[PDB]
Symmetry: D3
Subunit: 157 residues, 6 copies
């Protein structure tokens, strides 16, 4: 079984983000076509250790920001597949940027939406960058070695 | 006097977005380095001239979506400069994607924030993709012939 | 009145190609949004000014080929708009490659088909790379300052 | 033995295409550096099942075309190597486009020509996009882990 | 008379670099196809207006470096043509990187070599990235509206 | 243990280059995350055999140069990681070009500097293209499966 690495695109601000985060991570743990160990998970890759939760003064530090921004781009460009954990009611400008970067870097762009949310409207441009969008319950068995193009069965605005 | 064209990146989904939209458009009309006539305004380039909020029968039309998505990419790639009307409290996933696309197309990426909001934290990834960020009241006089890189006078989250 | 430059993508290997070539060139001469003088015409930019059909000693010259190939890429990348004079029944692999290159360089990709052939099926991949396709008789009046995406009024095979 | 995946670029219209198709497929089956299972073969990836042979009404469907076009680009961008089964007498605009896309996506671009045809003239731009061109009989033993640049020993037009 | 802008690629780290710098700048002032006013000159675009050789406190400032690096990339991407003032005996790693970046941004890459040095061997990779190379005394009259590919009249090492 | 391939970017002119070359090669031989066998080493990939050491007439041959230039680009684009063996006192325009190419091709760009030299000033643009710069003694244990962004702890000019 060949395995692909992913960039774990996902917010961690809100309760719905955190729930979807935990679920997507569990699905990837079960997916035999994913090498999670060698995948890039932003939350586990805080520059120089420094946790911004505990030291918010770093949010005005240009060096911290440059390094964190660059680490994210690096994580996208050096991994096989771009994953976007996507909450239709809580769409994220940062994830959006990353989707557009991933597109430019020639990566497959997979959005994953919670089953309870699948079908709800998403932004045209999110709809368009995506090569495919699936429900959370399909993530554990998605074949990342044979990724295909498909359309969201759902609304755009 | 050389003139550049822009892509008008902006949400139109809240009252603060719409207010910023109207102000930015007025500033561009007054800027002697911008050719607004030959610029791309997404809201005037929707497929078949139809907005999905005014004709919700198009919410699941895949042809309308494909064409509108593609028209936007074309608007970014064929114009000189990428503009992002940006509300820190109401950031737009669609604009984010477009910032990433613009970066891929080698365009200058200028964010413009209402004066009342300038200085407030913005998303890391918006901070990073952007080449520069200014107050709404600076847009009318910005020299688009000599565009330069600068850091936002403001924090990220 | 702003003017754009074009790369003149066109075969010259059949009578219908050559007829379309001559017509497209005449239309461009009359289009007030085109600067034809500073446009790239492949047939005037062959290495050492020599065409391989008139001097078949060059059929295996690797230097002539490298230079002519590279001159074409340079012609696409340094001009505003990619034009493809396109015969549905006599499609050209060389033009196809160039359509792909132009896409990579972020150029508007306009196919122009003789009126007598407009509406006939074209290759899927030509249909997709193209931003738009028009009849020969529309080329003289096309506004290259406001280029937009549209679907071919026609089938694919 | 590391293995690479390919996109199987090849027409299936004519008798010469079909013969070369069958031969190239057999060679890849024998090549220990190719993972054919996880490679993208357009003919086995018809969108939503729908075979256009049996339902030609889909050739005027914009959604079918968008999806099929995108599936092909996706198959090129997500695989390691671009293969072009190339018939000098029957050159294909669609394959051409794909070669240019593959180039832009940073892939090795390998043309394979039937032994009976190797040496016959090919288009300059096909000659140029290619990183290498080989005879059909060399495909089964080509080392895809150590791909090199070389010139076609043959004519261009 | 159409005018193009340039990025002024040049070292300033030896006497021969500086002499070539001054000569190239004078030639550009006289070239009727160049808009020098709206061109990017790296030495006038250092972050905070400070040169590290005049203020060595900035030798380890990561913010100064990030901004100056980014300003240069922006200068290449937003101007029409990439110029490289090139000393065969004193080749510059920084300019080299920029040649590669310019290639990525689809810009014409023109090297200009002092007359006294024109014809001397240059690095293979400089020879290859360049679209063309000329003598300093040709820069004042070069037609930047019709830029073409040519091989250096000179060797590589 | 997954393994990545590299392009071995390094000069071989001077005594310091040759020493660093030998050391970097030995470190890669010891690194379990590198597949050196399938990596691209320019010095072992002389076109058509022809060694330029022994036949310097090839330095004025345009075909030799085209092929060697292209083989290098091909070696960068088809491998996972770009390595630059970097001597601060002897910076190389060719390596510079390759770094910029690698960046454009979405590769991780790792500079490696001799321990005796680590901390010495390097060009701004080398500092910027790099995703990371390490000392020679860290190369044997660098985890190429989890590459990260970091800043040189050293001077720029
Ligand atoms: N402080 C921050 C803010 C944003 N991010 C990146 O941006 C996405 C969420 O906006 C996430 O996918 C994440 O990669 C980050 O890493 N750190
Ligand atoms: N229905 C829609 C939705 C989005 N957009 C594009 O995306 C941004 C707004 O999210 C805008 O910047 C716009 O380009 C659009 O054009 N039409
Ligand atoms: N001998 C040749 C052959 C091809 N071409 C380029 O490719 C297209 C014609 O196939 C044309 O669009 C042209 O750019 C060329 O320039 N010279
Ligand atoms: N109806 C069609 C037409 C074309 N193609 C793609 O284009 C190439 C042949 O033109 C082939 O390589 C194939 O990928 C396709 O998939 N379906
Ligand atoms: N301190 C520095 C060092 C380098 N540069 C850029 O890189 C080239 C000179 O190496 C120049 O072409 C210039 O663009 C710079 O701008 N500032
Ligand atoms: N004659 C030459 C000259 C240069 N090179 C490539 O350029 C880098 C050193 O300049 C090296 O990294 C090497 O790839 C080459 O291969 N052959």
């Amino acid at each position: 079984m060949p395995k692909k690495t992913i960039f774990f695109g996902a917010g961690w601000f809100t309760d719905r983000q955190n729930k979807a985060y935990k679920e997507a991570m569990e699905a990837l743990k079960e997916n035999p076509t994913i090498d999670l160990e060698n995948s890039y998970v932003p939350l586990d890759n805080q520059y120089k250790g420094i946790r911004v939760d505990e030291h918010p003064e770093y949010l005005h530090d240009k060096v911290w920001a440059t390094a964190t921004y660059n680490n994210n781009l690096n994580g996208i460009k050096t991994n096989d597949i771009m994953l976007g954990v996507y909450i239709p009611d809580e769409e994220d400008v940062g994830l959006g940027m990353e989707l557009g970067y991933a597109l430019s870097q020639g990566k497959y762009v997979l959005l994953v939406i919670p089953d309870e949310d699948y079908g709800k409207p998403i932004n045209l441009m999110s709809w368009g960058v995506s090569d495919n969008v699936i429900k959370m319950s399909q993530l554990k068995d998605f074949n990342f070695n044979k990724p295909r193009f498909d359309f969201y069965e759902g609304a755009v605005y």
